[PDB]
Each structure stands twice: as structure tokens, then as C-alpha cells.
Amino acid sequence: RSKDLRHAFRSMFPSSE
């Protein structure tokens, strides 16, 4: 699951909160 690291890019946005 090395491709799962791409899911962290979504946490960089304000929509993560």
C-alpha cells in the first residue's frame, strides 16, 4: 500500500478538519 501515501495530500487541505 505505497499508493496510500497519496491520501496524505488530502489532509493538507482545509477540508481535512
CSV table of N, CA and C in Angstrom, one decimal:
chain,number,residue,atom,x,y,z
A,1,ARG,N,0.8,-1.2,0.0
A,1,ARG,CA,0.0,0.0,0.0
A,1,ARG,C,0.9,1.3,0.0
A,2,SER,N,1.7,1.4,-1.0
A,2,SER,CA,2.6,2.6,-1.1
A,2,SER,C,1.9,3.7,-1.8
A,3,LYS,N,0.8,3.3,-2.4
A,3,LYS,CA,0.0,4.3,-3.1
A,3,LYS,C,-1.0,5.0,-2.1
A,4,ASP,N,-1.0,4.5,-0.9
A,4,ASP,CA,-1.9,5.1,0.1
A,4,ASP,C,-1.3,6.4,0.6
A,5,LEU,N,0.0,6.6,0.4
A,5,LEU,CA,0.7,7.8,0.8
A,5,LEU,C,0.1,9.0,0.1
A,6,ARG,N,-0.6,8.8,-1.0
A,6,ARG,CA,-1.2,9.9,-1.8
A,6,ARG,C,-2.4,10.4,-1.1
A,7,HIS,N,-2.9,9.7,-0.1
A,7,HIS,CA,-4.1,10.1,0.6
A,7,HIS,C,-3.7,11.2,1.6
A,8,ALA,N,-2.5,11.4,1.9
A,8,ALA,CA,-2.0,12.4,2.8
A,8,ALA,C,-2.1,13.8,2.2
A,9,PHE,N,-2.1,13.8,0.9
A,9,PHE,CA,-2.1,15.1,0.2
A,9,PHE,C,-3.5,15.8,0.4
A,10,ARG,N,-4.5,15.0,0.8
A,10,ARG,CA,-5.8,15.5,1.0
A,10,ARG,C,-5.9,16.1,2.4
A,11,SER,N,-5.1,15.7,3.3
A,11,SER,CA,-5.1,16.2,4.7
A,11,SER,C,-4.4,17.6,4.7
A,12,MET,N,-3.7,17.9,3.6
A,12,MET,CA,-3.0,19.2,3.5
A,12,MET,C,-4.1,20.4,3.3
A,13,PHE,N,-5.3,20.0,2.8
A,13,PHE,CA,-6.3,20.9,2.6
A,13,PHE,C,-7.1,21.2,3.8
A,14,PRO,N,-7.9,22.3,3.8
A,14,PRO,CA,-8.7,22.7,5.0
A,14,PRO,C,-10.0,21.8,5.1
A,15,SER,N,-10.2,20.9,4.1
A,15,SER,CA,-11.3,20.1,4.1
A,15,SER,C,-11.1,18.8,5.0
A,16,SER,N,-9.9,18.8,5.6
A,16,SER,CA,-9.5,17.6,6.4
A,16,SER,C,-10.1,17.8,7.8
A,17,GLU,N,-10.4,19.1,8.2
A,17,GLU,CA,-10.9,19.4,9.5
A,17,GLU,C,-12.5,19.2,9.5
